[PDB]
Amino acid sequence: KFVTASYNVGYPAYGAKFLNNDTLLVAGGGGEGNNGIPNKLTVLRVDPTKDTEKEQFHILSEFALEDNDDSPTAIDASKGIILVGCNENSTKITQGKGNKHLRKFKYDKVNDQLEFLTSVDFDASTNADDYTKLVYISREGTVAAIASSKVPAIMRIIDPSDLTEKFEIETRGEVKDLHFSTDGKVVAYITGSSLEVISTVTGSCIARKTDFDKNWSLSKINFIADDTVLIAASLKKGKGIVLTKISIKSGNTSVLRSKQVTNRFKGITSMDVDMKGELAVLASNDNSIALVKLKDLSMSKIFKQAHSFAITEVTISPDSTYVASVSAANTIHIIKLPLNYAN
Ligand SMILES: [K+]
Ligand SMILES: [K+]
Ligand SMILES: [K+]
Fold first, then answer.
1. Topological domains (Cytoplasmic): residue ranges?
2. Domain annotation for the chain: domains and CATH numbers
3. What CA–CA distance (Å, rounded) separates 11 from 213?
């Protein structure tokens, strides 16, 4: 019923995104050391049904980042535009030489090749410990949002064409996760205990919510419909994951439905929702990939030990055919779903 396949990409992977139905973008590396381990962007064609590794995972192109660059920490892609969070060498950073840590690439869909376009230093930081925590770009590729680990927490909303900052949002607490609505006109973000919704056009508040259970730690957020977000939280005391749907309208929010979908794990490291808005995928702390059917908020399948440790990102192809996950254990896990699985 499910076809699965695994591949060792050759370096610890920290980001993954599907460029189309069939093509996976992966980013990561061994970091800045003179260690014989590359820092790379890798583009692969995947087909988990085939018999050999070369057929299941075909590498279309690779971009070698600097051997003395940090490993990439975050990526996203939309319509051939690729945005990558990646510190330069710590020495260059520390000695005030500049940190072009937000980089723009182009994937040529016909050439399959990767091109470095331009990069920019947004944080103006001289602390090598600061990294780009979140990188997201809207479906149409017209707006993006990035988030530093640095203090105080700031969300920058930028133009992906030339990497200019549209506006700077000083968030109140630490930004946990982040998502754009499908039209790209709204970005929603979460801290550990609040939801904030902002227009990407004006920078104005649209809606806000802070009355979550005090035992909840908000973890991830994805849009599932035009005016509806899905928030994943973990139990502070106890073990479990709550998925909640919150509707956003006219300055107010309302909880459509809330439900704990499992008690098997303590927390999750990644979440994605398919474009159809029907399926959610979770990557757990204990290294599982879980499939959640959004109509019922029910967990319908768990792939135990899909990586050996640290699952960094999970991504669903636009046709809802493949579920891809990558980890710091150097592995890529591919799941093929039966057609209309969630239905
Ligand atoms: K290296
Ligand atoms: K890194
Ligand atoms: K998200």
1. 1-343
2. 1-343 (2.130.10.10)
3. 39
